[PDB]
Design a protein around this ligand. Structure first.
Ligand SMILES: CCCCCCCCCCCCCCCCCC(=O)OC[C@H](COP(=O)([O-])OCC(O)COP(=O)([O-])OC[C@@H](COC(=O)CCCCCCCCCCCCCCCCC)OC(=O)CCCCCCCCCCCCCCCCC)OC(=O)CCCCCCCCCCCCCCCCC
Ligand SMILES: CCCCCCCCCCCCCCCCCC(=O)OC[C@H](COP(=O)([O-])OCC[N+](C)(C)C)OC(=O)CCCCCCCCCCCCCCCCC
Ligand SMILES: CCCCCCCCCCCCCCCCCC(=O)OC[C@H](COP(=O)(O)OCCN)OC(=O)CCCCCCCCCCCCCCCCC
Ligand SMILES: CCCCCCCCCCCCCCCCCC(=O)OC[C@H](COP(=O)(O)OCCN)OC(=O)CCCCCCCCCCCCCCCCC
Ligand SMILES: CCCCCCCCCCCCO[C@@H]1O[C@H](CO)[C@@H](O[C@H]2O[C@H](CO)[C@@H](O)[C@H](O)[C@H]2O)[C@H](O)[C@H]1O
Ligand SMILES: CCCCCCCCCCCCO[C@@H]1O[C@H](CO)[C@@H](O[C@H]2O[C@H](CO)[C@@H](O)[C@H](O)[C@H]2O)[C@H](O)[C@H]1O
Ligand SMILES: CCCCCCCCCCCCO[C@@H]1O[C@H](CO)[C@@H](O[C@H]2O[C@H](CO)[C@@H](O)[C@H](O)[C@H]2O)[C@H](O)[C@H]1O
Ligand code: SF4
Lengths: 70, 155, 115, 51, 174, 82, 97, 114, 96, 98, 318
């Protein structure tokens, strides 16, 4: 019966779901729990590079808030 | 243990080869009509993993389905030679088996096994589609018995 | 770096699959096996002989049309211009001349293959 | 001024048309079958093709 | 080593040029032009022109597809020549590589080289701009201006492409 | 009458080309009739890709604001209502 | 131009793209904008024969901006003198460098 | 052709505004209004003078106003602001439209208190 | 539907662009000090490396004009680790 | 100049020599013409991109457009040459010595 | 951590490709009143594994007349480029975020054609050559229309960035304002992927196997894996272009599920179409695109330039 085609579809579906889920979770793991910063334009790269210096640990994704202004 | 490993590796390659048999799209005469009926929905040879492919480079089995004449003999041997190995030949029907109704003709090869080695002989004129399927399953069980790695280990 | 690493990984994965494909299986090479395929009989003439192209004129037109899209692909950016009166006129002008050239080649039977 | 290196030069055609070369552009010949899905397995259709 | 990325790609650029300039079978010449077009796209992209680099690659891929078709129709022989098959082709090929290899060897050794004219070999990054922080791509702004500033360019190019179709129809109507 | 006689014929024989010309005609024509076309250029002008360099107050620029929140200078109230 | 129809008709066909200090989209300046402006304004109206000598300073600076040959010569010299002292054990770069 | 006059490392010293771009973006609109005067005096100087060396003093007043501006937020609206820029920082594009709720809380806080 | 959504997307782009305009003065002031600091450091370590050279004068301009000229990449990062040079030259282009 | 210019100028020269030193196939020489234009595109793009000549960024695109018109023109003549002689050999085009 | 991400992209791609072969044979089978593979593993679930092992232990052949280097190169290019097509795909986050992702995909699709041309030519056999030259005609047929179809859609998105298409379609699928383009795009992807009714470069019933007739075992498998990978990738591209999935930044896996379902169904549609129609003649394919899609695509391109300007709905550049 036609529903016996479903098992192969589900296997195909799980495999195709993995790359999207993996990319999203590796981005959070590698960027301190947040989305990876997107820098399509030089301004965005400039700010990200400034965040690297500001972090004090050479990571553009370590944020500094009010506690860093005396 | 080396023997245990090569025994299990033989099972894997034997399983893979018999589970995925691709006959060459090669038919000669009436017997090819029953071969067509094996692909048809009632028997659905595809459900065993048996898929026709036109190119000899992508074929694992030659089903000689019909009379082989002298004029055709060099062509059949050519496409057999052009199959990569391992390769198998199934002889289908009396004509291919030994000449059949035309055994005494001046223009007929008295059995395709004068031209190519044959693994399975399917009798009938024509064999029913089910009889040919029985012959293919017999070919599978022959492949399952192969001991290439076991013999290599003991060389 | 990420881009070069991704390309290297893909084409290395493909190369490894070919290396395994050639070195793992048992081979048995002889002349008849490796002969060119032509449905059981030996080929008549080299496969390197000239092969007439009946769509040769469409093929040349493709070159001209394939450069038009290079001129058109900037249109999403050109639409951000403040001078939208000029931009819209020149965008429509370019596409119409492409249509006129197509209509000319069509009416002159350039799109029919040589028989 | 005739010279040895131009002894083989002929005046051009009166109307600028040189005769068409007798060169033969050979048609490609193809074995269509017998082993072919559309040849019913036993037809050796020898076809001359231009393209 | 990565700081010399443009140099490395430019070396492959020349190697592809030596490829098709030695003139083997046009099948392999087209291959050499595709490699050069590919790395050429990489060179221009590394100077901030992503759109220019991808466009030249896209155009030349389409062009070499047509050349391939025309080659099998009008520029083929029984034994198409690879670079090793012909003595003239091999000599040009080897000569190109040796001239290239010696320019590379000496420009790297001295961080400079005189090949007719003087070229500095400090690495190509040294000339780059130091202060970018706009919210747009300058190459995209310049290219998009074709439709506002380049009215005259649009007219002459558009007209030439239309005439081009008219002309190739005339030229090939025996 | 010939307006409909010709159109009906092409509708029957080449509806693809009839649709193509009708769509192309609307592209050329509607932009000159639309009342919303004028805002396309205003929105493109109101987009500030560049810094707005201040002017040296020389003592007589009433139309220019001293602070970004002063009543002078262009406003985008029309844009909030679009 | 051999025939200056652009001037006669007051139509701009191509001179908008002749120089890099002309009006650019969104007022993006070229890297050598100041240098070329200074050269163009120095040589304006006096003719090439005079401009070749009387605006030599402006043109040389503009050429240096364009190709940076003198800067690259200078940096090539400093980098060479550093490797001379590194191998001879006569200089340690600072931490910040 | 001359020695390039550079300010000494001592002259280039100022207390930096060491916060991340998400913090700067979250406070940008209010910062644009509160620190307009020194900011626009620095930008007039840079564009007229065309020399970073000729606007260092104006640059420091930009920094000093920034620190004063951020100290007011810290004193009066620390928690509402920390929530707001934390929301901005999550986004890969740092989009305003994903944090209108936290923005409203921050906006009303600074309005009431300052 | 697309008309309304693209209008709102344009109003969002303006808000995003204006936040940048608010911060540009501070970013510009930071960039000027950083550039001048890097150039000053380059000058300190030019003197030591090139003290012994016969005809050298430290910090000499290549330009006849005394006008401020924006340094090129080699001028600013000329004597620094490749990691910092590679990030400053190709970091943006190579970022995914 | 910068070292990239050494290889781009070299690539142009290689293709120019390739163009001027014919063999038999006319298609091979047309390829050398296309290669010459590719080096000019890259060489022009580098200059324009590095100098931030914003409006010149369209110039390389215009260069490609007339490159295709030349290639299409070259291929059109190759078709006629091939039709006449059955090869694209350039030694067949020697009728006009006389 | 980036290398791990690469592997978590291409290992699943190849597994999905393997089980797409099973799904096709079952879907075709039931549409043909039969079952398809149901013996090798339960419901045929081990059948792709058997075929893969079979081919890679099969003897690979280098034809006597073939050009050796190009013969090997072409299958490597085919699979390598097929995997490269996936790196800018936002699912919802791309592996590589590109400003001009669409243009990158166009360029890489053009380069993948050369794996057909060179394999066919390097085989030095007549059916292989005929297959390769059919690929030249196929590319000439669809490539110009394919690019201009994308352009018309991107005039609503405002950028060449694949992730922007998600933002563009947050309120409504682009299939609504551009279903004529979706129609023509969908057909163009069948031609682009050499899929029925445009399976001409292989054309089994005509050319035996066309461009890959001389390929066996592992080298042949590379071509099969490439084509089936491109079929899935082009339907993901179609889903992003026209059936944009909403993206919640805090629950990115809801996007992935919804987007994966859409891409699967579009892939099932490819198999469905294969089961339903006869094959085109390859000159009739060229006339389909040039005489029908191109005149309409040019007209719609004019319309989609004017429409944003006349409705004051031009999208943001960023
Ligand atoms: C990943 C790469 C995938 C491709 C792998 C290629 C090697 C595969 C192994 C192989 O060639 O088979 C054995 C093959 C030998 O088998 P054979 O049957 O005895 O002889 C084959 C022919 O004699 C010679 O074989 P042929 O008839 O094919 O011609 C030889 C070669 C011509 O070789 C040459 O004459 C010079 C070297 C060519 C390569 C240099 C690039 C050409 C210029 C373009 C610049 C590109 C720069 C990169 O032809 C080519 O055009 C090579 C194209 C390589 C493209 C690489 C992509 C760029 O090669 C050897 O191992 C020796
Ligand atoms: C998506 C990719 C899918 C890849 C699938 C990979 C297949 C996975 C299953 C592997 C099963 C094990 C391989 C057995 C098949 C070997 C083919 C065969 O039947 O030969 C029979 C032959 C039989 O030889 P024979 O000696 O008995 O007789 C042949 C000689 N005449 C003709 C005279 C009789 O077996 C062998 O020769 C050796 C068997 C060794 C088995 C172990 C294999 C080791 C692999 C290393 C090979 C070296 C090259 C490196 C390749 C890369 C390594 C991974
Ligand atoms: C004939 C045999 C052919 C065999 C095929 C071999 C494989 C070749 C595969 C194709 C090679 C061409 C690759 C071109 C990549 C272009 C992709 C791209 O433009 O994006 C990559 C990225 C630019 O990113 P972008 O968004 O445009 O701007 C930066 C914003 N942060 O920029 C980068 O990530 C940096 C990339 C620089 C290095 C490019 C090297 C390419 C050279 C060709 C190899
Ligand atoms: C007539 C035969 C034609 C054959 C051609 C092939 C066509 C097949 C097309 C297959 C794809 C059709 C769409 C599949 C629906 C999948 C539903 C789903 O999983 O997502 C739910 C979706 C709403 O969610 P969402 O897409 O995020 O909302 C849009 C806002 N951006 O859905 C809302 O309900
Ligand atoms: C073979 C040659 C073919 C050549 C074909 C040329 C067709 C050109 C048709 C006209 C295209 C532009 O049409 C014209 O667009 C501009 C803006 O875009 C419109 O202008 C309208 O919007 C702009 C701003 O967007 C306002 O400045 C203007 O006040 C307003 O009227 C015109 O009202 C319209 O007439
Ligand atoms: C602005 C872009 C949109 C506008 C459309 C632009 C493209 C216009 C295409 C050509 C239009 C006229 O040119 C074309 O002439 C030929 C005559 O041989 C006609 O073609 C004729 O023979 C061919 C082949 O049998 C078929 O298309 C058709 O059966 C018949 O009409 C076309 O019907 C007509 O369309
Ligand atoms: C198909 C064939 C393709 C052929 C491709 C040919 C590519 C051309 C080769 C270019 C090699 C460039 O080589 C590059 O030279 C510079 C020299 O400063 C080296 O850079 C060097 O700089 C500093 C100097 O202070 C050293 O301390 C450092 O150890 C070293 O890396 C790079 O480490 C090297 O990678
Ligand atoms: S064996 Fe019988 S059925 Fe088969 S081909 Fe011969 S005569 Fe026909």
């Amino acid at each position: 019966m036609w529903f016996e085609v479903l098992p192969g579809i589900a296997v195909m579906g799980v495999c195709l779901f993995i790359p999207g889920m993996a990319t999203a979770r590796i981005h959070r793991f590698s960027n301190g729990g947040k989305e990876k910063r997107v820098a399509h334009y030089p301004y965005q790269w400039y700010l990200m590079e400034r965040d690297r210096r500001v972090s004090g640990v050479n990571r553009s994704y370590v944020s500094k808030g009010l506690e860093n202004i005396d | 243990r080396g023997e245990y490993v090569v025994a299990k590796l033989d099972d894997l390659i034997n399983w893979a080869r018999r589970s995925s048999l691709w006959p060459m799209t090669f038919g000669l005469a009436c017997c090819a009509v029953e071969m067509m009926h094996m692909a048809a929905p009632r028997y659905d040879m595809d459900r065993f993993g048996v898929v026709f492919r036109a190119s000899p480079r992508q074929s694992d089995v030659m089903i000689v389905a019909g009379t082989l004449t002298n004029k055709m003999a060099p062509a059949l041997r050519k496409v057999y030679d052009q199959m990569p190995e391992p390769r198998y030949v199934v002889s289908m029907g009396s004509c291919a088996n030994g000449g059949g109704y035309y055994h005494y003709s001046y223009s007929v090869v008295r059995g395709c096994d004068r031209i190519v080695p044959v693994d399975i002989y399917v009798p009938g004129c024509p064999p029913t589609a089910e009889a040919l399927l029985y012959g293919i399953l017999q070919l599978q069980k022959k492949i399952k018995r192969e001991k290439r790695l076991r013999i290599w280990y003991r060389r | 770096m990420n881009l070069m690493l991704a390309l290297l990984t893909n084409f290395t994965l493909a190369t490894l699959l070919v290396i395994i494909a050639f070195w793992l299986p048992q081979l048995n090479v002889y002349s008849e096996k490796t002969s060119p395929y032509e449905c059981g009989f030996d080929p008549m003439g080299s496969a390197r002989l000239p092969f007439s192209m009946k769509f040769f004129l469409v093929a040349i037109t493709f070159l001209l049309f394939d450069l038009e899209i290079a001129l058109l692909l900037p249109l999403p950016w050109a639409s951000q211009t403040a001078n939208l009166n000029t931009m819209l006129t020149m965008a429509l002008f370019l596409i119409i001349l492409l249509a006129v050239s197509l209509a000319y080649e069509w009416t002159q039977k350039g799109l029919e293959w040589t028989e | 001024y005739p010279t040895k290196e131009t002894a083989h030069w002929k005046p051009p055609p009166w109307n600028d048309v040189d005769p068409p070369k007798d060169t033969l552009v050979s048609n490609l010949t193809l074995n269509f079958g017998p082993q072919h899905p559309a040849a019913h397995g036993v037809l050796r259709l020898v076809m001359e093709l231009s393209g | 080593m990565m700081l010399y990325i443009v140099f490395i790609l430019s070396v492959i650029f020349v190697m592809g040029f030596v490829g098709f300039s030695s003139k083997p079978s046009p099948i392999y010449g087209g291959l050499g032009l595709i490699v050069s077009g590919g790395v050429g796209c990489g060179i221009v992209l590394n100077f901030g022109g992503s759109f220019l680099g991808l466009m030249v690659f896209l155009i030349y891929l389409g062009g070499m597809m047509v050349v391939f078709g025309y080659t099998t129709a009008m520029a083929t022989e029984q034994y198409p020549e690879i670079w090793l098959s012909n003595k003239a082709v091999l000599g040009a090929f080897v000569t190109g590589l040796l001239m290239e290899f010696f320019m590379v060897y000496y420009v790297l050794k001295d961080k400079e080289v005189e090949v007719v004219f003087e070229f500095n070999g400090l690495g190509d990054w040294v000339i780059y701009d130091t202060g970018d922080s706009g919210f747009f791509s300058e190459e995209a702004m310049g290219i998009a201006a074709l439709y506002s500033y380049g009215t005259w360019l649009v007219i002459v190019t558009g007209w030439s492409l239309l005439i081009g179709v008219v002309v190739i129809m005339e030229i090939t109507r025996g | 009458e010939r307006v409909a006689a010709f159109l009906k014929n092409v509708w029957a024989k080449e509806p693809v080309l009839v649709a193509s010309f009708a769509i192309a005609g609307l592209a050329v024509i509607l932009p000159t009739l639309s009342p919303y076309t004028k805002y396309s250029l205003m929105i493109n002008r109101a987009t500030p890709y560049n810094y707005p360099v201040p002017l040296r107050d020389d003592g007589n620029m009433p139309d220019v604001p001293s602070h970004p929140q002063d009543p002078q200078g262009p406003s985008l109230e029309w844009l909030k209502r679009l | 131009p051999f025939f200056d129809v652009q001037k006669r008709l007051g139509v701009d066909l191509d001179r908008w793209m002749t120089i890099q200090s002309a009006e650019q989209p969104h007022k993006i300046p070229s890297r050598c904008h100041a240098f070329e402006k200074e050269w163009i304004e120095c040589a304006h109206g006096i003719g090439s024969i005079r401009a070749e000598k009387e605006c030599k300073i402006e043109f040389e600076d503009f050429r240096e901006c364009l190709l940076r040959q003198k800067t690259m010569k200078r940096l090539h010299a400093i980098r060479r003198q550093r490797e001379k002292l590194i191998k001879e054990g006569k200089y340690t770069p600072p931490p910040h460098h | 052709p001359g020695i390039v006059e550079l300010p000494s490392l001592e002259d280039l010293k100022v207390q930096e505004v060491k916060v991340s771009s998400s913090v700067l973006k979250a406070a940008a609109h209010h910062y644009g209004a509160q620190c307009d005067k020194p900011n626009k005096e620095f930008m007039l100087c840079r564009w007229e003078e065309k020399d970073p060396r000729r606007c260092l003093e104006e640059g420091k007043l930009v920094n000093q106003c920034a620190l004063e501006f951020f100290r007011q937020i810290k004193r009066h609206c620390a928690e509402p602001f920390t929530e707001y820029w934390t929301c901005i920082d999550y986004s890969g594009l740092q989009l305003f439209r994903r944090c209108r709720k936290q923005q409203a809380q921050f906006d009303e806080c600074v309005l009431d208190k300052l | 539907s697309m008309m309304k959504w693209n209008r709102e997307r344009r109003r969002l782009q303006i808000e995003d662009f204006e936040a940048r305009i608010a911060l540009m003065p501070l970013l510009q002031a930071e960039k000027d000090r950083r550039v001048l600091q890097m150039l000053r450091e380059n000058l300190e370590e030019e003197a030591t490396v090139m003290k012994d050279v016969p005809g050298w004068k430290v910090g000499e301009s290549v330009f006849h004009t005394t006008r401020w000229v924006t340094p090129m990449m080699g001028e600013l990062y000329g004597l620094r680790a490749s990691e910092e040079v590679l990030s400053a030259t190709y970091g943006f282009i190579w970022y995914t | 100049m910068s070292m990239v210019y050494m290889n781009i100028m070299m690539a142009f020269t290689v293709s120019l020599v390739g163009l001027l030193m014919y063999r038999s196939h006319l298609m091979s020489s047309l390829l050398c013409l296309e290669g010459m234009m590719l080096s000019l595109f890259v060489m022009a793009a580098l200059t324009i991109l590095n100098s931030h000549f914003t409006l010149a960024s369209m110039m390389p695109i215009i260069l490609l457009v007339f490159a295709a018109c030349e290639a299409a023109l070259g291929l059109s003549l190759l078709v006629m040459v091939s039709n006449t002689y059955g090869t694209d050999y350039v030694q067949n085009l020697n009728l006009l010595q006389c | 951590m980036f290398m791990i991400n690469i592997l978590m992209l291409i290992i699943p791609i190849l597994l999905a490709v393997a089980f797409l072969t099973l799904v096709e044979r079952k879907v075709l089978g039931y549409m043909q009143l039969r079952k398809g593979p149901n013996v090798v593993g339960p419901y045929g679930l081990l059948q792709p594994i058997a075929d893969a092992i079979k081919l890679f232990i099969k003897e690979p052949l280098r034809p006597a007349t073939s050009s050796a280097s190009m013969f090997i190169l072409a299958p490597i290019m085919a699979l390598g480029l097929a995997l490269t097509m996936w790196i800018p795909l936002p699912m919802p986050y791309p592996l590589i975020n590109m400003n001009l992702g669409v243009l990158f995909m166009l360029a890489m699709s053009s380069l993948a054609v050369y794996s057909i041309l060179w394999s066919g030519w390097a085989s030095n056999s007549k059916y292989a050559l005929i297959g390769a030259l059919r690929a030249v005609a196929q590319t000439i047929s669809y490539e110009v229309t394919l690019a201009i179809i994308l352009l018309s859609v991107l005039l609503m998105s405002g950028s060449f960035t694949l992730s922007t298409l998600i933002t563009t379609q947050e309120q409504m699928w682009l299939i609504l304002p551009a279903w004529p383009l979706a129609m023509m795009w969908f057909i163009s992807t069948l031609a682009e992927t050499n899929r029925a009714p445009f399976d001409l470069t292989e054309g089994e019933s005509e050319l035996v196997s066309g461009f890959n007739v001389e390929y066996a075992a592992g080298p042949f498998a590379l071509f099969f894996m490439a084509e089936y990978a491109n079929i899935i990738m082009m339907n993901i591209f179609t889903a992003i272009l026209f059936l944009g999935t909403s993206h919640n930044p805090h629950m990115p896996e809801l996007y992935t599920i919804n987007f994966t379902i859409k891409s699967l169904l579009l892939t099932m549609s490819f198999l469905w179409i294969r089961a339903s129609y006869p094959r085109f003649r390859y000159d009739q394919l060229m006339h389909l695109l040039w005489k029908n899609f191109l005149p309409l695509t040019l007209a719609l391109c004019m319309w989609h330039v004017s429409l944003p300007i006349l409705t004051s709905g031009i999208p943001p550049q960023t």
